[PDB]
Structures are given as C-alpha cells and as structure tokens.
Amino acid sequence: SWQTYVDTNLVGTGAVTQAAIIGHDGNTWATSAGFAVSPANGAALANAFKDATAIRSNGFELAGTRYVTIRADDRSVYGKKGSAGVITVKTSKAILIGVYNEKIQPGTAANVVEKLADYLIGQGF
C-alpha cells in the first residue's frame, strides 16, 4: 500500500527518480529501492512545514544530498540542486518525498507528488 504508492504512483510514473513517504515524526513508512532518508533529516523536514525559518537559512538534507529551499509553505517544501531537486508535500498523516534528476521537468515532478498528496488527503491520510 504505502509501498505501492511509492513504487507505482511516484516512481513508476517516471516523474521522480526516487521517493519516500514519511510520518510527521520523520520515520519512513515506505521507500523506493535503495533510497533512504534518515529519521533525523525527516523530522527536520517535518518541522519545516511548521517553521520554515531553519530551512530558509540553511536549506535541508535528504539522503546525503543537500538542498536549497525554493518553496516553503504549510503544505509544500521544495528544494533544488542544479538540474535536480526534491518535491515534498505534507498530508494529514505523512509527508511525501520525490526527487527528480536532470532528465526531469521540475514541475512534472511537482504535479505527480502534489497529485498523490491530494489523493491521500481525501482518504483521511
């Protein structure tokens, strides 16, 4: 279920190259093959949705790579690193995380992730 959201609705689409779904405490509910985000980074991200102050000054880390905050509101937090980047979105019970590489259109990745979030939110999650 969470694994199929990640494997099918996120990675399987082609819009993100790697993806994870985290709880509001930052611990991973499911993750794409060989992609791993630390409970430490996850929590920080989780906090960002509440208070972006910290991430706005230093950005945020996810699976080794460091990112720069492009967007930060109470629902979405997006980072970028050259042609790459990460789209993260917050639902009622989790936070979706999707990274895309050079080959992907940033807004293509944002559409997929935000589309998954709307779905989950309408399912009570």
Side-chain angles (χ1 to χ4, degrees), residues 6 20 22 24 35 44 55 69 72 89-90 93 98 119:
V6 157
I22 238 86
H24 289 185
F35 171 60
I55 64 156
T69 317
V89 188
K90 175 174 176 171
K93 302 301 185 196
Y119 174 72

Side-chain angles (χ1 to χ4, degrees), residues 57-74:
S57 79
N58 313 300
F60 57 83
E61 289 202 59
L62 254 0
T65 295
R66 178 75 157 186
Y67 292 96
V68 169
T69 317
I70 311 174
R71 182 201 285 224
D73 51 68
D74 52 309

